């Protein structure tokens, strides 16, 4: 399904099932397809599952401009308002956890019953004087540089090495997970995926997280090589009042796929809470 925002951007979204709405916000450089296993599970359990493609990702249009978290957040706000959702549970994975946080910081929680930050970027990835445990800018520069040189290879390298922990001792890649990650990545616009690197790594969601006044689940692997857990999941859980954190021992960043049934069960229990 498609909806057009006030600025003319066409957002593609999926909407399956009936019951309380659960909105999923995907990671970079993926699209709504990456959430399909949590969506099929939860819709079968009696919920309505909604997942949109961020601007410039998947099937949404690919604007040259507005590839930043304020806009991501405002596009999500317009989708929620368009569907007139009430009592929604917003789940964001990685960059999409930043999207959810910024949506709440800019728009509040009148339409939100609960939120979840899964392997998510908040509060702030970048190493700064206030965030000394973050990652150095050179890391993100490296990702922009590989994006411009050969993004199709970058995606294959990310999925083959850090993203699913296939580079860990005793582990080996599997082609279905590498190529599906690559495939979604190639549907995104090059400009949109490129500009998103700064938006997921430099945006500081600290103030957004202090405005979250609804039950919040934080899920993070402690072997996440892409979004280091101390400066993300642990730090989010500390900032969000009343949040619950589940640390998956030894789990990598893409735990939606490597710890699928575990995550499915944790999301359902959280919703029923």
mmCIF file of C-alpha atoms in Angstrom:
data_model
loop_
_atom_site.group_PDB
_atom_site.id
_atom_site.type_symbol
_atom_site.label_atom_id
_atom_site.label_comp_id
_atom_site.label_asym_id
_atom_site.label_seq_id
_atom_site.Cartn_x
_atom_site.Cartn_y
_atom_site.Cartn_z
ATOM 1 C CA UNK A 1 0.000 0.000 0.000
ATOM 2 C CA UNK A 2 1.117 3.576 -0.609
ATOM 3 C CA UNK A 3 0.585 6.897 1.089
ATOM 4 C CA UNK A 4 1.971 10.277 -0.032
ATOM 5 C CA UNK A 5 3.323 12.678 2.583
ATOM 6 C CA UNK A 6 2.693 16.426 2.611
ATOM 7 C CA UNK A 7 6.002 16.972 0.819
ATOM 8 C CA UNK A 8 5.136 14.582 -2.040
ATOM 9 C CA UNK A 9 7.231 11.609 -0.897
ATOM 10 C CA UNK A 10 5.503 8.299 -1.581
ATOM 11 C CA UNK A 11 5.781 5.901 1.346
ATOM 12 C CA UNK A 12 5.178 2.183 0.727
ATOM 13 C CA UNK A 13 3.806 0.187 3.666
ATOM 14 C CA UNK A 14 2.467 -3.269 4.577
ATOM 15 C CA UNK A 15 -0.607 -3.721 6.752
ATOM 16 C CA UNK A 16 -1.635 -7.266 7.717
ATOM 17 C CA UNK A 17 -4.131 -8.670 10.238
ATOM 18 C CA UNK A 18 -6.474 -6.995 12.709
ATOM 19 C CA UNK A 19 -6.316 -6.098 16.411
ATOM 20 C CA UNK A 20 -4.001 -3.737 18.255
ATOM 21 C CA UNK A 21 -1.552 -2.145 15.827
ATOM 22 C CA UNK A 22 2.145 -2.919 15.977
ATOM 23 C CA UNK A 23 4.270 -0.662 13.796
ATOM 24 C CA UNK A 24 7.761 -1.835 12.815
ATOM 25 C CA UNK A 25 10.521 0.522 11.650
ATOM 26 C CA UNK A 26 13.403 -1.205 9.803
ATOM 27 C CA UNK A 27 17.166 -0.936 9.917
ATOM 28 C CA UNK A 28 19.699 0.393 7.354
ATOM 29 C CA UNK A 29 19.978 -0.152 4.469
ATOM 30 C CA UNK A 30 17.006 -2.538 4.547
ATOM 31 C CA UNK A 31 13.255 -2.147 4.203
ATOM 32 C CA UNK A 32 9.963 -3.470 5.679
ATOM 33 C CA UNK A 33 10.818 -6.929 4.317
ATOM 34 C CA UNK A 34 13.432 -7.429 7.043
ATOM 35 C CA UNK A 35 10.701 -7.514 9.710
ATOM 36 C CA UNK A 36 8.567 -10.232 8.067
ATOM 37 C CA UNK A 37 9.286 -12.968 10.661
ATOM 38 C CA UNK A 38 8.164 -10.868 13.653
ATOM 39 C CA UNK A 39 5.198 -9.575 11.590
ATOM 40 C CA UNK A 40 3.898 -13.039 10.574
ATOM 41 C CA UNK A 41 4.277 -14.276 14.157
ATOM 42 C CA UNK A 42 2.477 -11.356 15.791
ATOM 43 C CA UNK A 43 -0.328 -11.088 13.215
ATOM 44 C CA UNK A 44 -1.013 -14.797 13.787
ATOM 45 C CA UNK A 45 -1.300 -14.010 17.498
ATOM 46 C CA UNK A 46 -4.139 -11.552 16.980
ATOM 47 C CA UNK A 47 -2.370 -8.254 16.277
ATOM 48 C CA UNK A 48 -2.410 -5.917 13.269
ATOM 49 C CA UNK A 49 1.137 -5.494 11.921
ATOM 50 C CA UNK A 50 2.210 -2.394 9.949
ATOM 51 C CA UNK A 51 5.705 -1.857 8.464
ATOM 52 C CA UNK A 52 6.625 1.016 6.166
ATOM 53 C CA UNK A 53 9.622 1.528 3.868
ATOM 54 C CA UNK A 54 11.655 4.536 5.051
ATOM 55 C CA UNK A 55 12.012 7.249 2.418
ATOM 56 C CA UNK A 56 14.558 6.150 -0.185
ATOM 57 C CA UNK A 57 14.407 2.515 0.912
ATOM 58 C CA UNK A 58 12.515 -0.480 -0.558
ATOM 59 C CA UNK A 59 9.472 0.613 -2.514
ATOM 60 C CA UNK A 60 9.192 4.174 -1.232
ATOM 61 C CA UNK A 61 10.176 6.998 -3.565
ATOM 62 C CA UNK A 62 13.772 8.261 -3.308
ATOM 63 C CA UNK A 63 13.984 11.947 -2.597
ATOM 64 C CA UNK A 64 17.328 13.670 -3.016
ATOM 65 C CA UNK A 65 16.566 15.571 0.203
ATOM 66 C CA UNK A 66 15.225 15.078 3.717
ATOM 67 C CA UNK A 67 17.338 11.980 4.429
ATOM 68 C CA UNK A 68 17.610 12.715 8.142
ATOM 69 C CA UNK A 69 15.946 11.591 11.411
ATOM 70 C CA UNK A 70 13.608 14.587 11.835
ATOM 71 C CA UNK A 71 12.130 13.809 8.401
ATOM 72 C CA UNK A 72 12.085 10.026 8.990
ATOM 73 C CA UNK A 73 10.199 10.744 12.203
ATOM 74 C CA UNK A 74 7.741 13.131 10.513
ATOM 75 C CA UNK A 75 7.083 10.669 7.658
ATOM 76 C CA UNK A 76 6.273 7.991 10.296
ATOM 77 C CA UNK A 77 4.043 10.531 12.071
ATOM 78 C CA UNK A 78 2.119 11.082 8.844
ATOM 79 C CA UNK A 79 1.677 7.318 8.244
ATOM 80 C CA UNK A 80 0.357 6.829 11.825
ATOM 81 C CA UNK A 81 -1.996 9.815 11.443
ATOM 82 C CA UNK A 82 -3.086 8.663 8.004
ATOM 83 C CA UNK A 83 -4.026 5.262 9.455
ATOM 84 C CA UNK A 84 -5.481 6.951 12.541
ATOM 85 C CA UNK A 85 -3.692 4.483 14.770
ATOM 86 C CA UNK A 86 -4.472 4.405 18.443
ATOM 87 C CA UNK A 87 -2.716 2.496 21.230
ATOM 88 C CA UNK A 88 0.064 1.477 18.861
ATOM 89 C CA UNK A 89 3.219 -0.443 19.782
ATOM 90 C CA UNK A 90 6.204 0.955 17.893
ATOM 91 C CA UNK A 91 9.188 -1.377 17.376
ATOM 92 C CA UNK A 92 12.358 -0.001 15.744
ATOM 93 C CA UNK A 93 15.374 -2.141 14.791
ATOM 94 C CA UNK A 94 18.797 -0.341 14.640
ATOM 95 C CA UNK A 95 18.354 2.847 12.664
ATOM 96 C CA UNK A 96 14.593 2.328 12.979
ATOM 97 C CA UNK A 97 14.945 2.479 16.801
ATOM 98 C CA UNK A 98 16.333 6.038 16.219
ATOM 99 C CA UNK A 99 13.308 6.728 14.022
ATOM 100 C CA UNK A 100 10.869 5.621 16.750
ATOM 101 C CA UNK A 101 12.737 7.669 19.361
ATOM 102 C CA UNK A 102 12.705 10.824 17.230
ATOM 103 C CA UNK A 103 9.035 10.296 16.378
ATOM 104 C CA UNK A 104 8.213 10.254 20.089
ATOM 105 C CA UNK A 105 10.501 13.183 20.884
ATOM 106 C CA UNK A 106 8.863 15.309 18.135
ATOM 107 C CA UNK A 107 5.265 14.110 18.396
ATOM 108 C CA UNK A 108 4.731 12.602 21.845
ATOM 109 C CA UNK A 109 2.874 9.419 22.761
ATOM 110 C CA UNK A 110 -0.797 10.203 22.415
ATOM 111 C CA UNK A 111 -1.048 7.386 19.812
ATOM 112 C CA UNK A 112 1.512 5.084 21.380
ATOM 113 C CA UNK A 113 0.802 2.425 24.000
ATOM 114 C CA UNK A 114 4.386 1.058 24.075
ATOM 115 C CA UNK A 115 7.777 1.196 22.274
ATOM 116 C CA UNK A 116 10.702 -1.119 21.667
ATOM 117 C CA UNK A 117 14.272 -0.460 20.706
ATOM 118 C CA UNK A 118 15.818 -3.570 19.163
ATOM 119 C CA UNK A 119 19.596 -3.540 18.485
ATOM 120 C CA UNK A 120 18.942 0.204 18.261
ATOM 121 C CA UNK A 121 21.106 3.265 17.656
ATOM 122 C CA UNK A 122 20.055 5.511 20.597
ATOM 123 C CA UNK A 123 21.297 7.252 22.448
ATOM 124 C CA UNK A 124 24.275 8.227 20.299
ATOM 125 C CA UNK A 125 26.783 6.126 18.349
ATOM 126 C CA UNK A 126 29.423 8.733 17.669
ATOM 127 C CA UNK A 127 32.402 9.217 19.987
ATOM 128 C CA UNK A 128 32.264 12.750 21.431
ATOM 129 C CA UNK A 129 33.407 14.521 24.625
ATOM 130 C CA UNK A 130 30.007 13.770 26.162
ATOM 131 C CA UNK A 131 29.956 10.209 24.744
ATOM 132 C CA UNK A 132 33.548 8.968 25.101
ATOM 133 C CA UNK A 133 32.636 5.299 24.735
ATOM 134 C CA UNK A 134 31.104 5.847 21.224
ATOM 135 C CA UNK A 135 32.699 4.920 17.875
ATOM 136 C CA UNK A 136 35.137 7.321 16.206
ATOM 137 C CA UNK A 137 34.030 9.294 13.181
ATOM 138 C CA UNK A 138 36.585 7.399 11.074
ATOM 139 C CA UNK A 139 34.331 4.313 11.344
ATOM 140 C CA UNK A 140 31.395 6.117 9.725
ATOM 141 C CA UNK A 141 33.675 7.784 7.198
ATOM 142 C CA UNK A 142 34.806 4.289 6.248
ATOM 143 C CA UNK A 143 31.190 3.254 5.605
ATOM 144 C CA UNK A 144 30.499 6.341 3.469
ATOM 145 C CA UNK A 145 33.727 5.741 1.521
ATOM 146 C CA UNK A 146 32.856 2.083 0.841
ATOM 147 C CA UNK A 147 29.267 3.170 -0.065
ATOM 148 C CA UNK A 148 30.668 5.445 -2.745
ATOM 149 C CA UNK A 149 33.296 2.962 -4.022
ATOM 150 C CA UNK A 150 31.129 -0.176 -4.227
ATOM 151 C CA UNK A 151 27.982 -0.273 -2.069
ATOM 152 C CA UNK A 152 26.885 -3.647 -3.529
ATOM 153 C CA UNK A 153 30.146 -5.130 -2.215
ATOM 154 C CA UNK A 154 29.888 -3.237 1.103
ATOM 155 C CA UNK A 155 26.479 -4.838 1.718
ATOM 156 C CA UNK A 156 27.886 -8.278 0.929
ATOM 157 C CA UNK A 157 30.841 -7.594 3.289
ATOM 158 C CA UNK A 158 28.668 -6.280 6.161
ATOM 159 C CA UNK A 159 26.303 -9.264 5.996
ATOM 160 C CA UNK A 160 29.123 -11.717 5.509
ATOM 161 C CA UNK A 161 31.152 -10.446 8.453
ATOM 162 C CA UNK A 162 29.879 -8.275 11.340
ATOM 163 C CA UNK A 163 26.117 -7.968 10.847
ATOM 164 C CA UNK A 164 25.135 -11.543 11.735
ATOM 165 C CA UNK A 165 28.341 -12.489 13.560
ATOM 166 C CA UNK A 166 29.389 -14.886 10.760
ATOM 167 C CA UNK A 167 32.969 -13.621 11.275
ATOM 168 C CA UNK A 168 33.053 -15.010 14.878
ATOM 169 C CA UNK A 169 35.291 -17.964 15.660
ATOM 170 C CA UNK A 170 33.545 -21.170 14.643
ATOM 171 C CA UNK A 171 30.899 -19.384 12.590
ATOM 172 C CA UNK A 172 30.326 -19.418 8.838
ATOM 173 C CA UNK A 173 28.141 -17.352 6.533
ATOM 174 C CA UNK A 174 24.987 -18.616 4.915
ATOM 175 C CA UNK A 175 24.034 -17.286 1.516
ATOM 176 C CA UNK A 176 20.329 -16.780 2.070
ATOM 177 C CA UNK A 177 21.033 -14.281 4.895
ATOM 178 C CA UNK A 178 23.881 -12.534 3.009
ATOM 179 C CA UNK A 179 21.959 -12.127 -0.245
ATOM 180 C CA UNK A 180 18.660 -11.033 1.307
ATOM 181 C CA UNK A 181 20.507 -8.271 3.210
ATOM 182 C CA UNK A 182 22.305 -7.292 -0.051
ATOM 183 C CA UNK A 183 19.069 -7.402 -2.061
ATOM 184 C CA UNK A 184 17.170 -5.027 0.197
ATOM 185 C CA UNK A 185 20.224 -2.762 0.295
ATOM 186 C CA UNK A 186 20.228 -2.487 -3.547
ATOM 187 C CA UNK A 187 16.568 -1.385 -3.601
ATOM 188 C CA UNK A 188 17.413 1.673 -1.493
ATOM 189 C CA UNK A 189 18.482 4.894 -3.267
ATOM 190 C CA UNK A 190 22.263 5.500 -3.194
ATOM 191 C CA UNK A 191 21.818 9.088 -1.976
ATOM 192 C CA UNK A 192 19.263 8.009 0.650
ATOM 193 C CA UNK A 193 21.395 5.153 2.045
ATOM 194 C CA UNK A 194 24.517 7.370 2.006
ATOM 195 C CA UNK A 195 22.959 10.296 3.842
ATOM 196 C CA UNK A 196 21.408 7.906 6.348
ATOM 197 C CA UNK A 197 24.858 6.919 7.664
ATOM 198 C CA UNK A 198 25.296 10.347 9.340
ATOM 199 C CA UNK A 199 21.629 10.263 10.448
ATOM 200 C CA UNK A 200 21.969 6.934 12.322
ATOM 201 C CA UNK A 201 25.427 7.600 13.775
ATOM 202 C CA UNK A 202 25.505 11.332 14.650
ATOM 203 C CA UNK A 203 21.916 12.022 15.735
ATOM 204 C CA UNK A 204 21.818 12.246 19.537
ATOM 205 C CA UNK A 205 18.467 10.832 20.728
ATOM 206 C CA UNK A 206 19.268 11.464 24.416
ATOM 207 C CA UNK A 207 16.560 14.057 24.826
ATOM 208 C CA UNK A 208 14.070 11.984 22.848
ATOM 209 C CA UNK A 209 14.586 9.022 25.183
ATOM 210 C CA UNK A 210 13.943 11.173 28.272
ATOM 211 C CA UNK A 211 10.534 12.113 26.769
ATOM 212 C CA UNK A 212 9.451 8.457 26.378
ATOM 213 C CA UNK A 213 6.713 8.020 28.989
ATOM 214 C CA UNK A 214 5.396 4.592 27.943
ATOM 215 C CA UNK A 215 6.519 1.031 28.676
ATOM 216 C CA UNK A 216 9.600 0.388 26.583
ATOM 217 C CA UNK A 217 11.416 -2.836 25.747
ATOM 218 C CA UNK A 218 15.135 -2.613 24.851
ATOM 219 C CA UNK A 219 16.670 -5.739 23.288
ATOM 220 C CA UNK A 220 20.384 -5.922 22.413
ATOM 221 C CA UNK A 221 23.021 -8.569 21.759
ATOM 222 C CA UNK A 222 26.204 -8.127 23.777
ATOM 223 C CA UNK A 223 28.311 -9.249 20.787
ATOM 224 C CA UNK A 224 26.762 -6.626 18.511
ATOM 225 C CA UNK A 225 29.660 -5.437 16.378
ATOM 226 C CA UNK A 226 27.656 -2.850 14.434
ATOM 227 C CA UNK A 227 25.952 -0.973 17.272
ATOM 228 C CA UNK A 228 28.134 -1.582 20.392
ATOM 229 C CA UNK A 229 25.810 -2.416 23.337
ATOM 230 C CA UNK A 230 27.303 -0.215 26.079
ATOM 231 C CA UNK A 231 26.771 3.084 24.232
ATOM 232 C CA UNK A 232 23.374 1.913 22.847
ATOM 233 C CA UNK A 233 21.034 -0.693 24.468
ATOM 234 C CA UNK A 234 22.444 -0.395 28.021
ATOM 235 C CA UNK A 235 22.551 3.398 27.795
ATOM 236 C CA UNK A 236 19.021 3.604 26.334
ATOM 237 C CA UNK A 237 17.646 1.328 29.024
ATOM 238 C CA UNK A 238 19.235 3.571 31.665
ATOM 239 C CA UNK A 239 17.739 6.740 30.113
ATOM 240 C CA UNK A 240 14.230 5.461 29.395
ATOM 241 C CA UNK A 241 12.179 5.600 32.595
ATOM 242 C CA UNK A 242 10.835 2.198 33.527
ATOM 243 C CA UNK A 243 12.319 0.454 30.507
ATOM 244 C CA UNK A 244 12.984 -3.290 30.391
ATOM 245 C CA UNK A 245 16.263 -4.517 28.823
ATOM 246 C CA UNK A 246 16.945 -8.071 27.625
ATOM 247 C CA UNK A 247 20.585 -8.723 26.786
ATOM 248 C CA UNK A 248 21.025 -11.666 24.367
ATOM 249 C CA UNK A 249 24.320 -13.294 25.364
ATOM 250 C CA UNK A 250 26.788 -13.599 22.489
ATOM 251 C CA UNK A 251 24.140 -12.358 20.000
ATOM 252 C CA UNK A 252 25.083 -10.270 16.954
ATOM 253 C CA UNK A 253 23.366 -7.234 15.543
ATOM 254 C CA UNK A 254 20.917 -9.054 13.207
ATOM 255 C CA UNK A 255 19.183 -10.944 16.022
ATOM 256 C CA UNK A 256 15.798 -10.546 14.324
ATOM 257 C CA UNK A 257 17.136 -13.405 12.219
ATOM 258 C CA UNK A 258 19.732 -15.214 14.378
ATOM 259 C CA UNK A 259 17.528 -15.237 17.524
ATOM 260 C CA UNK A 260 14.226 -15.061 15.685
ATOM 261 C CA UNK A 261 11.947 -17.242 17.806
ATOM 262 C CA UNK A 262 13.449 -15.778 21.036
ATOM 263 C CA UNK A 263 12.773 -12.243 19.841
ATOM 264 C CA UNK A 264 9.280 -13.176 18.640
ATOM 265 C CA UNK A 265 8.380 -14.521 22.124
ATOM 266 C CA UNK A 266 9.934 -11.468 23.881
ATOM 267 C CA UNK A 267 7.952 -9.043 21.703
ATOM 268 C CA UNK A 268 4.700 -10.881 22.360
ATOM 269 C CA UNK A 269 5.254 -11.044 26.133
ATOM 270 C CA UNK A 270 6.103 -7.358 26.173
ATOM 271 C CA UNK A 271 2.931 -6.463 24.295
ATOM 272 C CA UNK A 272 0.791 -8.590 26.618
ATOM 273 C CA UNK A 273 2.354 -6.812 29.622
#
